[PDB]
Symmetry: D2
Subunit: 237 residues, 4 copies
C-alpha cells in the first residue's frame, strides 16, 4: 500500500482508534495512530498557518499551528525518514468530512526541499509557492473531491454554492513533480512547508481534518479511507 | 504544432536556412530562423555556462555564454512572451547531431519563475536546481536519446561507452511540472535559468547544437526535426 | 557628491524643474530630471506595490506600480549601471513633504542581488525581506525623520500622534550591509526589489513623493534636498 | 563579555580544558567546553564542507562535516537559542593558531535566517552567499589577522606569501549586518549556514581550529583568546 508520513490537524476526536479526547495536531508515520500529539486550540472561522520542518542531521520532524494573536501549538518527533520513505516521493495535502463536516479551505501553500552535498550547491533543490490557486491547476494532481474555487482557494472537500461544506467528503491535492527526498550519497536533506487554511463549520463538532503528507509517487486515495482516516489510510491499524 | 521559444547554441552553420556562417547563439521565436544572433567563440573541451532571463515589464529576453577566463557573448530580443506563449508551459533542453556530431552533455541546470501581483508574495513561484543528475530522474521527461549517465551528467544525444558522440541523434529533457508562465491578473512575470554544458567532438566541424526551450505542455520531438532543426521544429520555415 | 540612481514616485508636479504636469513614476539617473516617465494614476488611501528590476545583460531598468484591481503603470530605461554606479553601493528608500504633505508609509520591502559567474553559483548573493518593521531596526540606517512606528510600519517622513503627516519633512532608510552591485569579472549582475506603501493626504495636492534608490555607500541627506528634490539631490540640475 | 554560541572544528586536543583526545567537532554554548562533541576524521589537504542548522520549534542545533568521498561526522545539541542569544546578533567565522599552526582558509560561505509569523511571508529573511571573496569585502568586518587574498579566499589567520601558516594568530570575519535572530511575536525562527574550508599544515599536529559563531552585535576578539580558546572566549571557563 502507500507509505504515508503526515502531519495531521485532527479536529474530531475518534477515541475508539487512538485520538486524544480533543482537537489535536499529530505526526503520523505509517499509521493513523499519531506517534506524538498536542492539543490544538482550534478556532473556526479564523485563518491558520502550519509550518513543518525536517532535517536529516537533526532527525526531527516538527510542526506548529498558530492564529493571529493566539498562541501556537507545537509537536515534534524524532525520526529518520530515510528509513521510512522511498527516495522519490510526492507531497500533497488532504482532508475529509464524515458524519460531521467543516470547510477544508487551503488558502496558500509552499514547499522547499534540498539535497545538499560537498559545497554550497544543493545537488538538488525544489521549491514551489502558491498564494492563490489557478482556476485550472496544471501543476496540481487533484484527487477525490478536491477543487480550486472561483476565489482561487483550494477546497479539498465538497462545499456547495452557498459555501456550505458537505459531509462524507474526501479530497487531496498532490504537487505534480515527484520530489527526490533523499539519496544514498547525500550529506543533508531538508524540506520545509507552510500552508494556510480556513475551517468553518455549521455543526458544534467539526470533523474530520486536514493533513500535509509525503507519500510514494503513486499515492492514490485508499478505499474506505474516509472520515476519521483522513484519506490516507485504509484501516486504523 | 508546438509553440516553441528557444535560445540556441548553434555550433553548425546552415547558412541556407538562416545561420550566419559561424558558431552563434540565437533567440528563436516560433521558428529555426533566429530573430537575433551573435558570434559564439565556441570552445570545444571547456565547460561553458549559459544564463537566460526574462521580465515581462522589461519585455526583453537575454542570454550570455561564458567560459572561465574567456569573454562572454550576449544576445537579446525584445518580445512580449504573453503573446507568444500559452499560460502553462514546460521548460526543457534539447540537442541533436546530424552528419557531424559532438557531445551534448548537460552538467547542471536551474530555473526559477515568479508570477507576481500586489506584494512581496509571488502568487506563484517555481524553482528547481540540479547539480548532478540521478540515474533515474523521476522529475525529468526524457524524450529521444536523452539519458543520464553514471557520472550524473544528462546526455541529450547518444554517446558510446568509450565516450564518443554519435551522429543523427535527437534528445530532449523537460522538467516534469507545468510552469505557469503568465496569467491575466499578473502584474509581473519573470524567469531565469542556467545550465552548464560540455561539448566535445572529433569532427573538424561539430554539429549541431544545444537549446534551452520553452514550449506547450504537451510538446514532443517533431518528426524530421533532427540535425539543423535541433529537435524543436518540423521544418525550417 | 552622491551618485544616485532612483525610481521615483513623484506625486507633486514641479513643472519648473522638469516634471510632467501630473503625478508620475520616473527613472532618475544622477539627476532629479527623470530620463523617462509615465503618469501614475495615484490613489490615496490605498496600498500600492512597486516592483523594480535590472539585469546587466539586458541593460534595462524597469519599474511598475499597481493597486489591487487597478491597472499598472510601467516605466523603463536602457542603461548600463556599471558605468553609472561604483562597485559597492547601498540601497534604501526616501521620501519628503514640502509645502504640501502626505504620509510616506512603507509597509514592506524586499531586495535581492546576484553577481553570477561561470556556474549556477552566484559568486555573491544578498537578500533581505521585511514584512514588518522592528521597533528598533538594528539593520536599517534611518536618515532624517525616518522612523518605524508602533505598528511595525516604516515612516520616512514626519507624522504626528493622530497620524497626520507633517510638511517639510525628509527621511531615508538605507539597508545596513553595503551591496557589491558589480565586479569587473562578473558575467551577469541582477537585482530585484519590491516595496509596499500607503500614501494618505489631507490637502488636495499631495506632495512630494517616495523613491527607491541605489547610491554610494556613504550617501547622506544632501543639504537643501527637501521637498521636490526627494532627499536625493542638492540642486535640480 | 560576549554571549557566544559556536560550532567548532577543533583540530588540536587540549584535554585539560575539555577536549576529547582527538580532532573533534563540537557545539559551544557560552564556553569553550563543548556541550557536545564528535570525532572528526580531519583530513589535511582536502577541502571540507560544514552545514549547520537550527529551527526554534525542533529546538535542536546540528552540524555535519564531510569531505568528497569520505564519510561525514555529525553532532547536535538540543537548545533554545531564544534563552541564550540576544534578539539581534552578528554571525561570523573565527580561527586561530598557537604553538602549532595550520591554514584556516575559507573558500565559500552562506547563511540564511528566516523569522516567521502567520503566513508564507517571513516577517524577516536575510541571506548572503559568497563563492569567492572580494579583495576588499566591504560587507565583512575583519577582526584580527583575517584578510582576503588574491585568489579570493578568506584567510582567518596569517599565512606567508609562500603560503606557509603562521603561529599565534587570531582571526575573525563577521557579516556586516545585524541579523534579527528572534523576536517576541515570532512563531518560527530558523537558520542555515554553510562554509567550505581548507586546512593545511606542516606540523605533525595542526592547531587550533575554525569555528562558525553567532554573537552579540558588538562582539570582538577577547584578549587572551588565542590558541585553544579560538578567538571566542577570554578564558577556558
Ligand atoms: C456511530 O458512532 C461511531 O461513528 C460516528 C460517526 O462516524 C462518522 O463520522 C465521524 C465524524 O465525522 C468520522 O470520524 C467517522 O469516520 C465516520 O465518518 C462517530 O461520531 C462516533 O464517534 C464518537 O463515538 C466513539 C464511540 O463512543 C468515540 O470513540 C469517538 O471519540 C466519538 O465520540 C463513532 O465512531
Ligand atoms: C547534403 O548537404 C546538406 O546536408 C549536409 C549534411 O546535413 C546533415 O548534417 C548537418 C550537420 O550535421 C545537419 O545540419 C543537417 O540537418 C543534416 O543532419 C550539410 O553539411 C550541408 O550544409 C552545408 O552546405 C549548405 C549548402 O551549401 C550550407 O547552407 C550550410 O551552411 C553548410 O555549409 C547541406 O545542408
Ligand atoms: C511659491 O511657488 C513655488 O513653491 C511652491 C511651494 O514649494 C514647496 O512645496 C512644494 C510642494 O510641497 C515642494 O515641491 C517644493 O520643493 C517646496 O517644498 C510650489 O507649490 C510651486 O509649484 C507650483 O508652481 C510652479 C510655478 O508656477 C509650477 O512649476 C509647479 O508645477 C507648481 O504648480 C512653486 O514651485
Ligand atoms: C606548555 O604546554 C601547554 O601549552 C602547549 C602549547 O600551547 C599553545 O599552543 C596550543 C596549540 O597550538 C594552543 O592550544 C594553546 O592555546 C597555546 O597557544 C600545549 O601543546 C600543551 O597541551 C598539551 O598538554 C596538555 C597538558 O598535558 C594537554 O591538556 C593537551 O591536550 C596537550 O596534549 C599545554 O597545554
Ligand atoms: Ca479524528
Ligand atoms: Ca545550425
Ligand atoms: Ca515633484
Ligand atoms: Ca583545542
Ligand atoms: Mn488524530
Ligand atoms: Mn542558428
Ligand atoms: Mn519627477
Ligand atoms: Mn574542542
Amino acid at each position: 500500500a502507500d507509505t504515508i508520513v503526515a502531519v495531521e490537524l485532527n479536529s474530531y476526536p475518534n477515541t475508539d482508534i487512538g485520538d486524544p479526547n480533543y482537537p489535536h495536531i499529530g505526526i503520523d508515520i505509517k499509521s493513523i495512530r499519531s506517534k506524538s500529539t498536542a492539543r490544538w486550540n482550534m478556532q473556526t472561522g479564523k485563518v491558520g498557518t502550519v509550518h513543518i520542518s525536517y532535517n536529516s542531521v537533526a532527525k526531527r520532524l516538527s510542526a506548529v499551528v498558530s492564529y493571529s494573536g493566539s498562541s501556537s501549538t507545537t509537536v515534534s518527533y524524532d525520526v529518520d525518514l530515510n528509513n521510512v520513505l522511498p527516495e522519490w516521493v510526492r507531497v500533497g495535502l488532504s482532508a475529509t468530512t464524515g458524519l460531521y463536516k467543516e470547510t477544508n479551505t487551503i488558502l496558500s501553500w509552499s514547499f522547499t526541499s534540498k539535497l545538499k552535498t560537498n559545497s554550497i550547491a544543493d545537488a538538488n533543490s525544489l521549491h514551489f509557492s502558491f498564494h492563490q490557486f489557478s482556476q485550472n491547476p496544471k501543476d496540481l494532481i487533484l484527487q477525490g473531491d478536491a477543487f480550486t474555487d472561483s476565489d482561487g482557494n483550494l477546497e479539498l472537500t465538497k462545499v456547495s454554492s452557498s459555501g456550505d461544506p458537505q459531509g462524507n467528503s474526501v479530497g487531496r491535492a498532490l504537487f505534480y513533480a515527484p520530489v527526490h527526498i533523499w539519496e544514498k550519497s547525500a550529506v543533508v536533506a531538508s524540506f520545509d512547508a507552510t500552508f494556510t487554511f480556513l475551517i468553518k463549520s455549521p455543526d458544534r463538532e467539526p470533523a474530520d481534518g486536514i493533513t500535509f503528507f509525503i507519500a510514494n509517487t503513486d499515492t492514490s486515495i485508499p478505499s474506505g479511507s474516509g472520515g476519521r482516516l483522513l484519506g490516507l489510510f485504509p484501516d486504523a491499524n
